[PDB]
Amino acid sequence: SIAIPTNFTISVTTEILPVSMTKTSVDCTMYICGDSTECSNLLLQYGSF
Amino acid sequence: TSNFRVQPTESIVRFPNITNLCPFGEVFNATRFASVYAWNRKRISNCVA
């Protein structure tokens, strides 16, 4: 027993692929210390984090 | 390279236009002082300290 199609169909299926995220950057002293020169001295004591 | 932050131009200070002298002179130097358990809590307001 064999089943053979007679009339075909053509579909269009969408596909979703991310390619990139939102490019982001950050600065410690503005984030961590906030332009304060008292914290700017403390932060550098923690090495090159 | 780094973060550019515009240096502040000058310093601006604003305080309420009140110049009443606080009664601390007689509060600390009061003649009679209460006991430890019956401490007389005093509220000071509307005066420059």
UniProtKB/Swiss-Prot annotation, chain A:
Glycans are attached at residue 7. Changing residue 6 to I: In strain: Alpha/B.1.1.7. Disulfide bonds join 33-39. Precursor of the fusion protein processed in the biosynthesis of the S protein and the formation of virus particle. Mediates fusion of the virion and cellular membranes by functioning as a class I viral fusion protein. Contains two viral fusion peptides that are unmasked after cleavage. The S2/S2' cleavage occurs during virus entry at the cell membrane by host TMPRSS2 or during endocytosis by host CSTL. This is Spike protein S2.
